[PDB]
Predict the 3D structure of the following.
Amino acid sequence: YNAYYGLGTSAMKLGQYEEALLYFEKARSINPVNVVLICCCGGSLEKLGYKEKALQYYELACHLQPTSSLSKYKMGQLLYSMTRYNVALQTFEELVKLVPDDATAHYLLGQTYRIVGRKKDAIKELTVAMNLDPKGNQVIIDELQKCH
Amino acid sequence: IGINKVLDHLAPSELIKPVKSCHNKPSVLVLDDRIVDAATKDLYVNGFQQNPTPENLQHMFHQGIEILDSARMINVTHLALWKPSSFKLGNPVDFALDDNYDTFWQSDGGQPHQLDIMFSKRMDICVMAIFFSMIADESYAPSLVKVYAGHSPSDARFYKMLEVRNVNGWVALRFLDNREDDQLLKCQFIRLLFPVNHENGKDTHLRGIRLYVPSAILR
Amino acid sequence: MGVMYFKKNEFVKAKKYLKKALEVVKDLDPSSRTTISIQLNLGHTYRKLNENEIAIKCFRCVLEKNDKNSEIHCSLGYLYLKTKKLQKAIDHLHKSLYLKPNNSSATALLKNALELNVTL
Amino acid sequence: MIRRAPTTLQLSHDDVTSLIDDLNEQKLKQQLNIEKT
Amino acid sequence: LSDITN
């Protein structure tokens, strides 16, 4: 299955999304129990445009592995794309509970809180993101400025 | 009417030609490393400085390579065909492109030595890197260099002049005269000439040469 | 004679002449690049005769007697994709790619086999 | 004498192309039938 | 040193 996964990735980087999905489905068929492969297939499917099927594969992955940071990250990204911030909020709170030391999680949590509207939550999370990491602070500065 | 307007757009004449008062002389680039300037610092990387010992030259040779490769850039020196004017059966152009100061390439033949750089696909060169060693190779030092440009051996045309006085380091030449909008050169055919060396030399070495162009998982 | 009757688009007599050739050489000398040609030609006639099981068994025999043969593996993949044995088909195609990476029809055959397998 | 190596039949490109086209229309046959059904 | 001038 590793080399089918590699063929799928090689097709994906060249833009042939349907071919990448074709490789990735076989890669699943070999090893049904997986998480990263499921996520890659859901990404290819949403690249094609099948958002509902990507969601179904994603929830299958999360049911199979309840503790999977990347899977939940992809759930949150897709829900943000789909304007489902109501449950995206719980996805991000669970994710930041999983990873407390990652500044990227704090950035997304604060951005979602600002989008939904909690000013205090947004400013607190963005200040925490500032404190943790100054490398990506340029975006964090703008995120504070727009919230303020 | 669409046909008529596009034809004017492809070939503007009255709008383009301002006065047609070109000076037609070849522009000459100054390479001296005793004067400090912002423009010279852009083209001269190693920095302005007795003659350093060869090991110091080797040390600065590596630091120049590292600095040039430090920036976001893509090297395609090995993505092209090379054909010098003549060999000497001791060192082909491989040791010139080996990124090693100790080894080098030498031609042997007619005085106007030619170095051909043919490309397979349309590559957009932005920075051309060349290394000189005036104190290390004073006998075979390149004194005057003329760089051409073109899409084929047929349509080779003059691009720039380069006069050598004292340059013991890497030389960077980004191209801006040809296209101000792109700040890069677009050609498939590049050739170099070395019509005469220092102190009336005969042959010429080439220590280094490089070409620069711009652009969760299971193992 | 079997080869020429095959080339003349008259398969039935080519088949019987190749069967006679095989039965004459069946008892003696399985090796020595003669039975290989006999079996390969007979399997080609059968695959052009639209009967596939006997062609498959003959091709398997010649594969056993000689493994390094890209064309044999492409023919095996052709026969297996004609039937619904997709796993054997794809295995023989990837092997054929292994013996010869730059095969023209093999790439399209692999693509077709994989899309059919995914849709199955 | 020296025996001449017997000629070997070759799997042409044309027939395999014909078969892959036939297979393509074969799978295209029931895809509309599935939608019909 | 070679490179003898005329």
Observations:
- Chains A and D do not touch (no CB pair under 8 Å).
